[PDB]
Amino acid sequence: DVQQKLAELERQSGGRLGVALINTADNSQILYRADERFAMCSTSKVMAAAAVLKKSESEPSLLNQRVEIKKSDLVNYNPIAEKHVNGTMSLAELSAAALQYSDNVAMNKLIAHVGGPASVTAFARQLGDETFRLDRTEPTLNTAIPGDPRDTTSPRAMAQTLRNLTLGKALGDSQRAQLVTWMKGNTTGAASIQAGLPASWVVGDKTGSGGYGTTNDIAVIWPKDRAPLILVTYFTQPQPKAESRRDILASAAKIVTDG
Numbered sequence: 240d241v242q243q244k245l246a247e248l249e250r251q252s253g254g255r256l257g258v259a260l261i262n263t264a265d266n267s268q269i270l271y272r273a274d275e276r277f278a279m280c281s282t283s284k285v286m287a288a289a290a291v292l293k294k295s296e297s298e299p300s301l302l303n304q305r306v307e308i309k310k311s312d313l314v315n316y317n318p319i320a321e322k323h324v325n326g327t328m329s330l331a332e333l334s335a336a337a338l339q340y341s342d343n344v345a346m347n348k349l350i351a352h353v354g355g356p357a358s359v360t361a362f363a364r365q366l367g368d369e370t371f372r373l374d375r376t377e378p379t380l381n382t383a384i385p386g387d388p389r390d391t392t393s394p395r396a397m398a399q400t401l402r403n404l405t406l407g408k409a410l411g412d413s414q415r416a417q418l419v420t421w422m423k424g425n426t427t428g429a430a431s432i433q434a435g436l437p438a439s440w441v442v443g444d445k446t447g448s449g450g451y452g453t454t455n456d457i458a459v460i461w462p463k464d465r466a467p468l469i470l471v472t473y474f475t476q477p478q479p480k481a482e483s484r485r486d487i488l489a490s491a492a493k494i495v496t497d498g
């Protein structure tokens with residue numbers, strides 16, 4: 240059965256695997272270590288962008304507001320922001336960069352705008368997600384030290400929240416659509432959950448990686464002519480310098496779907 244297959248995959252992987260699937264056809268779930276904490280890494284960018292979208296509902300100019308980019312903002316991973324040094328990007332542009340290029344400067348500007356990691360966390364609490372915690376900014380939020388609760392959530396909580404954000408009513412109509420549009424346009428993701436699904440299925444996802452070989456993906460999935468699914472696959476390893484294992488996420492996706 241599905242639980243045995245996931246346990247076997249986890250054993251083969253040598254690490255710790257967390258899965259939560261929500262099938263909106265029947266409100267059923269497939270859960271594996273779904274209440275354990277895992278470091279989110281770049282998957283936390285979805286919540287930061289959603290927090291800005293929420294604020295924009297009462298401030299219609301917000302997505303157009305200009306944010307300065309300076310050398311001092313640069314970190315290491317900034318493919319979009321590094322092209323606008325001494326200029327500005329709008330909050331919409333920063334959201335797109337964070338979600339589609341995983342730019343870490345862009346994430347930091349979303350965090351700062353809403354008031355910092357504790358404000359992103361407070362947004363999650365307002366949604367009814369009492370598990371999510373964003374503690375740090377980029378780049379340090381990705382350390383993924385085993386046993387460290389900073390910058391973690393559980394698969395169950397993140398699946399339920401991603402469902403709320405992309406399919407439910409957490410966000411206004413325009414803002415929900417915007418988040419879905421951004422996630423459907425991500426430039427990565429094909430090697431993770433998508434690699435375990437049929438070619439025809441439509442996916443909006445956000446990946447992440449970090450210390451301890453942490454390899455993550457969170458997705459909303461539209462199978463052909465079926466109600467959507469939400470899938471969270473989090474994975475981390477014992478060794479600080481372990482390499483990423485996107486194949487494990489693909490394999491988990493294949494196990495928990497009928498595709």
Ligand SMILES: *C(=O)N1C[C@H](NOS(=O)(=O)O)CC[C@H]1C(=O)NC1CCNCC1
Pocket residue numbers: 279280281282315316340341342343377378381427446447448449450
């Ligand atoms: C997110 O987890 N990131 C951002 C960037 N893109 O990876 S993706 O998987 O999101 O596409 C690089 C990996 C990761 C990240 O921020 N890693 C840190 C880079 C700086 N050193 C510490 C790890």
